[PDB]
Design a protein around this ligand. Sequence first.
Ligand SMILES: [Mg+2]
Ligand SMILES: [Mg+2]
Length: 38
Amino acid sequence: AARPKNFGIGQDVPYARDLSRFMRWPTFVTMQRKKRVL
RNA sequence: CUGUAAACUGAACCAACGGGAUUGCCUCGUGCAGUUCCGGGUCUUGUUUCGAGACAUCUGCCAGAUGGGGAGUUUGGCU
Ligand SMILES: [Mg+2]
Ligand SMILES: [Mg+2]
C-alpha cells in the first residue's frame, strides 16, 4: 500500500529537492542578477 | 494567536513513491499500457547563508611622529 517517508528534519533522506536558489551559479549568472538588483 | 520543525537513554538502519490527471486498451463499471502534477507551501523586483556596514578593514593617497629593523657614509691635524 502506502510507504510514508517523512522528509522532516533529520528523519529521512529527502528526494531531489530543487535547490536552484542556494546553489553556486556560474559567475555571469549571479553577476547579471546582482546587476539588475543593484 | 501565527511561527517549515512528524527523530534514541553506554555503538541497529533510513537513498529512485501514494494518489489524481492525460492517451488509447479486455471500454466507458473494473483494468493493462506511455505520460503529468500533488505532497513527501505559493510566489519571490531578489544578495548563496549569516555578521559588520558607509564604520571599517584597509583600496589609493599624502602628512606627522616613531623607526640600528635596515642602508649609505663618516669617525680631523699634531706628535
Ligand atoms: Mg561578469
Ligand atoms: Mg673610529
